[PDB]
Every structure is written in structure tokens, then in C-alpha cells.
Design a protein around this ligand. Structure first.
Ligand SMILES: OC[C@H]1O[C@@](CO)(O[C@H]2O[C@H](CO)[C@@H](O)[C@H](O)[C@H]2O)[C@@H](O)[C@@H]1O
Ligand SMILES: [Mg+2]
Length: 244
């Protein structure tokens, strides 16, 4: 029932340029009831909440955490989403495979959750190993996704759990149309958002994976901002003429 569904990544997108963050929130703050805000981050809910205390993120309506593997309404975790991602998902098998790669190192236990298996790719390792990993995991019957961002972070998620599917779920939950949605990303863990038919903005300081993705799949609904960080969101909002 609001005119805009704003979905944005936190690190390097919304957060990063403190001044931009501040004038972005000052702008949105004056029409807060005109849009639903969702932070689609790769951080765990607890980690997202910490960042908010640190930089002062404005309170969102929903939290799409851990790359969309955990959605949080004010009331709490969306148990429907959790049960939806749980189907046909065998975390243990996938992890056994991933652990097998010498180039992959497990990320802290706190970066892990029932539907997210994260690793760090060795800086000296050849990235093509991630394609090797992807097909190896994909060839198990298990519906998996491999998210590779910033050249090091690797995330194994259910095939129906990236930020893009979380967003689509949210659009249906809110009865918000794709033309009313704006997704803001900066890295490879944001590609899912841009695979959505929602208007999107790629921040200037975007990661190579995303810039590369934009070169091959970038459509007219996708906008490459000149501004970096939160400034890109204002730029996009003005661009797609949202919140007229
Ligand atoms: O935005 C990149 C930046 O986010 C961090 C924050 O801790 O990592 C999050 O996003 C990664 C990619 O989605 C996940 O693999 C990771 O588990 C999650 O915490 C930084 O590590 C990263 O540089
Ligand atoms: Mg990102």
C-alpha cells in the first residue's frame, strides 16, 4: 500500500559513505510512511543489528539477512520462509563437498546458519575453482546456489534463497509490484536482486563481479549510478522517479 519497496545491501551500498548515509536517511526520513524498507544483507541478523548501532541505520520494515536465507519481520523470524528453504536442503552433504576443497576455508561459525554455508576463497587460489565447486554441488540432486562476491566470500544457499528470491517473496507478501521496487547492490551477492524484474541500481564503487554481470545481463531496468554508497540510492530514486 506504499509507493516504494526499497531493498538495499548494507556494506558498501547503504553503509560506507557516512555523509551519504546521513543525507539519504534524512531524505527518506521525511516520507518514511511512503515506502517499505528492507535491508538485504549478507550479514547475520545479529551482525546487521550491530552495524545499525555502529552507523545508525534507520529502522527497516524487514531484514533480509544472510543473503536472504533469514527474513525477519518485526515480530521475528519468518518461519514460513525457513520451512520453505528447508525443503530438499541437505546442508551436511553440501558442506562435506565444500570442505573438500583445499582452496576453501570455513568462515566463522557465526557466519553460518541452517541455510547458509560460507567459505573464504584463498587469495592465491584460481577463482575457476568456484565453477568446479558449483558444478560439483549442482550435480548432487540438491537445489543449491553458489554466491561468489568480492573475489573471496563464497556462500552456499538453497536454490530459492538469494537476495532476489527473498525480495520476490517480500514483494508478494506486501503486494508490491516490481515496478514499485528498487534494489541496490554492490557485489556478487546482490546479483540475485538484479535478476529480479525490480528496478535496480548498481553503486559506483561496485565489485567487479557485479560490474561484469551488468555488462552481460544489464537491462533497461538496471541503472549504473555515478554516485557511490548511499548516494547511489538517492540517484536511483531520482532516476526512476520514485517517491514523486
Ligand atoms: O559486503 C561484503 C562484506 O560483507 C561481509 C560482512 O561481514 O560479509 C557478509 O557477506 C558475505 C557475502 O554475502 C558473506 O559470505 C559473509 O558471511 C557475510 O558476513 C564481509 O565479510 C564482506 O567483505
Ligand atoms: Mg553486496
Amino acid at each position: 500500500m506504499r509507493q516504494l519497496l526499497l531493498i538495499s545491501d548494507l556494506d558498501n551500498t547503504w553503509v560506507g559513505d557516512q555523509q551519504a548515509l546521513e543525507h539519504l536517511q534524512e531524505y527518506l526520513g521525511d516520507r518514511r510512511g511512503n515506502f517499505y524498507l528492507a535491508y538485504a544483507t549478507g550479514r547475520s541478523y545479529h551482525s546487521a543489528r550491530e552495524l545499525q548501532k555502529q552507523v545508525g541505520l534507520m529502522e527497516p520494515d524487514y531484514w533480509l539477512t544472510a543473503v536472504g536465507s533469514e527474513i525477519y519481520h518485526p515480530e521475528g523470524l519468518d518461519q514460513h520462509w525457513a520451512d520453505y528453504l528447508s525443503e530438499h536442503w541437505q546442508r551436511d552433504i553440501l558442506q562435506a563437498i565444500a570442505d573438500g576443497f583445499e582452496a576453501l576455508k570455513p568462515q566463522s561459525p557465526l557466519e553460518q546458519n541452517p541455510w547458509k554455508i560460507s567459505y573464504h576463497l584463498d587469495p592465491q587460489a584460481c577463482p575457476t575453482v568456484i565453477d568446479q565447486l558449483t558444478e560439483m554441488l549442482k550435480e548432487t540432486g540438491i537445489p543449491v546456489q553458489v554466491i561468489f562476491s568480492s573475489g573471496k566470500d563464497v556462500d552456499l544457499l538453497p536454490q530459492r534463497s538469494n537476495k532476489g528470491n527473498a525480495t520476490q517473496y517480500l514483494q508478494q507478501h506486501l503486494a508490491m509490484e516490481p515496478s514499485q521496487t528498487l534494489v541496490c547492490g554492490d557485489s556478487g551477492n546482490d546479483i540475485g536482486l538484479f535478476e529480479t524484474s525490480a528496478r535496480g541500481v548498481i553503486v559506483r564503487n561496485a565489485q567487479p563481479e557485479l560490474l561484469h554481470w551488468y555488462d552481460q545481463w544489464g537491462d533497461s531496468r538496471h541503472y549504473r549510478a555515478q554516485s557511490s554508497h548511499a548516494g547511489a540510492i538517492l540517484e536511483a530514486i531520482a532516476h526512476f522517479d520514485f517517491l514523486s
